Amino acid sequence: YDPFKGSDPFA
Amino acid sequence: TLPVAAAFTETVNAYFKGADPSKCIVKITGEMVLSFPAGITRHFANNPSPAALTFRVINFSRLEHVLPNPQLLCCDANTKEFWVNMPNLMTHLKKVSEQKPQATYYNVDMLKYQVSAQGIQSTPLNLAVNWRCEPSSTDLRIDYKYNTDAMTTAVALNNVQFLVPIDGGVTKLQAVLPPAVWNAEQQRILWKIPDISQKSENGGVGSLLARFQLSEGPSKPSPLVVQFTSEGSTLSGCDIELVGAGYRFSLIKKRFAAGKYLADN
Ligand SMILES: [Zn+2]
Ligand SMILES: [Zn+2]
Ligand SMILES: [Zn+2]
Ligand SMILES: [Zn+2]
């Protein structure tokens, strides 16, 4: 499970 | 400095009993994750020993049963400060970056926890279900209320699903509002509401209604199962802050979701 998926945190 | 991310993710479990708020059992769990960018591989080659990664969790009073990552942590009353173990973080991150060399970030489980909940008040979707079971018929009523008080700041519930099994040998569905979907093979009815919030009709207060004709009957009430996710707020009110130089937060993501979210007659 990914809390950020799919957006990128470093952009 | 190095960019880093954080994520709070809370799961809410509720169990309602007809219309009696005193009988509603609630349990909220949650997880805090720290995330690092691929660059760190090269960055922790140009650096060790790097700047100490220390953070504080705000409103830590609201949390109970807190389990800190044993490889990375923990060896006042409303604030807690943590110094991450850097050698183990680096060992870990080196392992994962060799394993997934073509990954843009690495998520690290930092904190697992429960959130003290005070019954129906701590519940973002209040529910009450009523069944009228005739020998040859069945009436179902689902009352719901969006509840801003359960959440730090008011935000919407997304992909809301109401699923309920209908026993008895269903034949026809009459008087349905709003429109739902009949699963014949599984003998069960499902409603979907895409968005529930204060900006919705009646301020998140509404009723699902259905009537069923029974070939055998009568039906025995089964549990209503609910689903929803929500982005933008925690249930706890916890935030996170960096302490000391070297690191910057690029994003703190807060979200919550129903886990086992049920309602009996
Ligand atoms: Zn760097
Ligand atoms: Zn302290
Ligand atoms: Zn590891
Ligand atoms: Zn996890």
Numbering used by the authors:
A (entry chain B): 644 to 654
B (entry chain A): 559 to 633, 639 to 828
Task: List passages from the publication reporting this PDB structure.
Src homology 3 (SH3)-domain growth factor receptor-bound 2-like (endophilin) interacting protein 1 (SGIP1) and its splicing variant, SGIP1α, are brain-specific homologs of FCHo1/FCHo2. The μHDs of SGIP1 and SGIP1α, which are identical to each other, are highly homologous to those of FCHo1/FCHo2. The μHD of SGIP1/SGIP1α also binds to the DPF motif-rich region of Eps1519. Thus, the SGIP1/FCHo1/FCHo2 μHD is a domain designed for recognizing the locally ordered structure formed by the two consecutive DPF motifs.
We next crystallized the complex between the SGIP1 μHD and two short μHD-binding Eps15 fragments containing two DPF motifs derived from the high-affinity μHD-binding site, Eps15-640–649 and Eps15-645–654. In the two structures, the two DPF motifs are recognized by a continuous cleft on the μHD. The two DPF motifs in the two structures adopt type-I β-turn conformations, and each is stabilized by two sequence-specific intramotif interactions. In our complex structures, the two DPF motifs are intimately packed against each other through hydrophobic interactions between the side chains of Phe in the N-terminal DPF motif and Pro in the C-terminal DPF motif. This arrangement of the DPF motifs brings the hydrophobic side chains of all of the Pro and Phe residues of the two DPF motifs together on one side, allowing their extensive recognition by the continuous hydrophobic cleft of the μHD. Two conserved Ala residues, Ala563 and Ala565, of SGIP1 are located at the bottom of this recognition cleft. Ala563 contacts the side chains of Phe in the N-terminal DPF motif and Pro in the C-terminal DPF motif, while Ala565 contacts the side chains of Pro and Phe in the N-terminal DPF motif. In the two structures, the two DPF motifs bind to the same recognition cleft on the μHD. However, the positions of the C-terminal DPF motif relative to the recognition cleft slightly differ between the two structures, probably due to differences in the lengths and the amino acid sequences of the linker region between the two DPF motifs. Nevertheless, the key interactions for DPF motif recognition by the μHD are essentially conserved in the two structures (see below).
